[PDB]
Write a protein that binds this ligand. Structure first.
Ligand SMILES: NC(=O)c1ccc[n+]([C@@H]2O[C@H](COP(=O)([O-])OP(=O)(O)OC[C@H]3O[C@@H](n4cnc5c(N)ncnc54)[C@H](O)[C@@H]3O)[C@@H](O)[C@H]2O)c1
Ligand SMILES: NC(=O)c1ccc[n+]([C@@H]2O[C@H](COP(=O)([O-])OP(=O)(O)OC[C@H]3O[C@@H](n4cnc5c(N)ncnc54)[C@H](O)[C@@H]3O)[C@@H](O)[C@H]2O)c1
Lengths: 325, 332
């Protein structure tokens, strides 16, 4: 039986699916294992199921000469040397875009949770202090607010779709303009970047991490915001300068920051932060999630099934449906 | 001689200015709620009252305030105000029919997402300093492809259905009256029986007033019907659900979760009301709570106060208040 290494915990159904066809070396824990431990497991493996924290470069592959396929439970290229894969005759597969929708859902949850002070609200009830309706605990809603999107691709559109009927005025800035018919359907108006930060009550980020988008949301752009403005980051940590965000919060100019992603997980950068600043983590005007954008059971199960089906295709000798090479 | 107006809770300065020409104001410009005893004392010789969520007006209250012409409520659900007793005393009762709807609807949906996505525990984890990167954790329930069931389909029910239009869910509802076909078609709403709603829904969103028919409607029997993992969200009134039965359903792991902006302990018109939220519910991990902040948006509260102020002025000027709940004799 061909050997398969699964680097992270999967649903038992996935183990049940693969076991008849593969000898399984599994990691049914919550932990990410060391690169050394992964290399050890994969040395004589014919297949790998890889997840977001996995990094595949030329060196990794050379140390796994029997590898025929890496089935990824993901969609991004950044961690995987596609050209080195083909060069060593290894199939690299990704999943179709099942991640955008749950992320967009979470982003809007984060906007409402941040605007309505949900962390502090829930803490107040849980503590036993609630004795009835009180005239305070004020927040900001979406109705009549201006929502600005920085970027307008897959998640930008998914979020704009889900804000239809919320009574907001939608605006965006993107490197590529939307076609006129989409703009009119969604009620989106294109604005300049400086204008987006100057005039938005909510700023929802919807852009990728590039050399040119690194720290795009910096002290200069944040200095433009309306006092009390809310910033939501479901994209990548490093499109934002987290130091500058924290300073804008402590100044009281930025009203809140919600994030699913953090500068510290963007490993390619030499002087990336090693953690999230404890003072950011302690700030009251925040709401955080541990990169759970696609953390919907049905979605995660389907992603894993896709990866698993792609691995079985490659092992049976055929070209996998979601082969990227 | 200006009519005396008792205002039980703090109001914006701009509302105090609109009323001051026509009324002597007996105010409570603190953050606190006064006792029953204190409110009765201030209203003894009052012509008007602006009441808020903590207020309760029964026959006994009105008997001790015989000069009252109007009670203007800054709320929509007037379950704690005895309408018939007001009418018997020739007192107008007014409410606010629409202004609370939208921020409450926004909140209800934010609660649904927060509850389904394990936001409380997820945030706590990041704040602990222990985040290292993606983990196969916090897998939850999203709206895409879910069955969303509404119990009640009035202003808040409709505002929520509106806000879910691009979310890829299957929307169904139970109400006392069906929506017309055209509205159902436009919003993708399918009418179902109550037990059907409870048996089939991934999310159950309550949008019902508190009355004798809805009192403990969401009871043990209905909760025994839910698909294991089902999420229940209550933005309306605490006592529409039996909190004891809800906790029990969470503890056996059948109900996947309960989110609530409102609590049984607030429903004063009940003789047997719980005096607190059960510490075991408050401590349960599969929850998400907010302290009756449905309409707590400054710009909205100002308009709510204004509506109530305007109704009170209309009554005091001798006309029929536009948002009167009851009807008094008027010269034709
Ligand atoms: N948190 C999560 O779980 C999660 C889930 C899905 C995607 N994401 C992340 O979200 C990001 C965006 O994803 P997507 O699929 O929408 O990307 P996309 O490529 O579909 O769209 C990107 C958009 O950003 C715009 N853009 C690029 N550079 C810009 C710039 N300098 N200024 C303004 N706009 C610019 C583009 O024109 C485009 O409109 C990705 O980096 C992805 O990794 C995160
Ligand atoms: N959390 C908050 O701050 C907040 C804000 C506004 C309203 N509320 C509460 O929410 C309630 C609903 O508000 P609304 O504006 O939608 O009220 P509404 O009167 O506009 O609509 C209530 C709906 O429930 C239906 N209904 C009544 N009894 C029913 C039953 N037994 N079975 C099925 N359906 C029934 C009615 O047919 C009506 O469609 C209010 O009465 C109030 O108690 C809370």
């Amino acid at each position: 039986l061909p050997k398969l290494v699964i680097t992270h915990r999967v649903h038992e159904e996935i183990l049940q699916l693969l076991a008849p066809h593969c000898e399984l070396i599994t990691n049914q824990t919550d932990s990410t294992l060391t690169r050394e431990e992964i290399l050890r497991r994969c040395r004589d493996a014919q297949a790998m199921m890889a997840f977001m924290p996995d990094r595949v470069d030329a060196d990794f592959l050379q140390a796994c000469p029997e590898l025929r396929v890496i089935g990824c439970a993901l969609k991004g290229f950044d961690n995987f040397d596609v050209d080195a894969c083909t060069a060593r005759g290894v199939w690299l597969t990704f999943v179709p875009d099942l991640l955008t929708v749950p992320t967009a859902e979470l982003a809007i949850g984060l906007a409402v949770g941040l605007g309505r002070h949900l962390r502090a609200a829930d803490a107040f009830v849980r503590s036993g202090q609630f004795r009835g309706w009180q005239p305070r605990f004020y927040g900001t809603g979406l109705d009549n607010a201006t929502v600005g999107f920085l970027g307008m691709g897959a998640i930008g559109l998914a979020m704009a779709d889900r804000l239809q009927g919320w009574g907001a005025t939608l605006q965006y800035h993107a490197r590529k303009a939307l076609d006129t018919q989409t703009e009119q359907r969604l009620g989106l108006r294109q604005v300049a970047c400086s204008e987006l930060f100057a005039s938005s009550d909510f700023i929802l980020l919807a852009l990728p991490l590039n050399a040119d988008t690194l720290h795009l949301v910096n002290a200069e752009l944040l200095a433009l915001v309306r006092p009390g403005a809310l910033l939501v980051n479901p994209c990548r940590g490093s499109v934002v300068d987290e130091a500058a965000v924290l300073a804008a919060l402590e100044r009281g100019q930025l009203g809140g920051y919600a994030a699913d992603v953090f500068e510290m997980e963007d490993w390619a950068r030499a002087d990336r932060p090693q953690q999230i600043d404890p003072a950011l983590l302690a700030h009251p005007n925040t709401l955080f999630t541990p990169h759970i954008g696609s953390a919907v059971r049905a979605v995660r199960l389907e992603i894993e099934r896709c990866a698993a089906q792609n691995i079985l295709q490659a092992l049976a000798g055929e070209r996998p449906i979601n082969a990227v090479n």
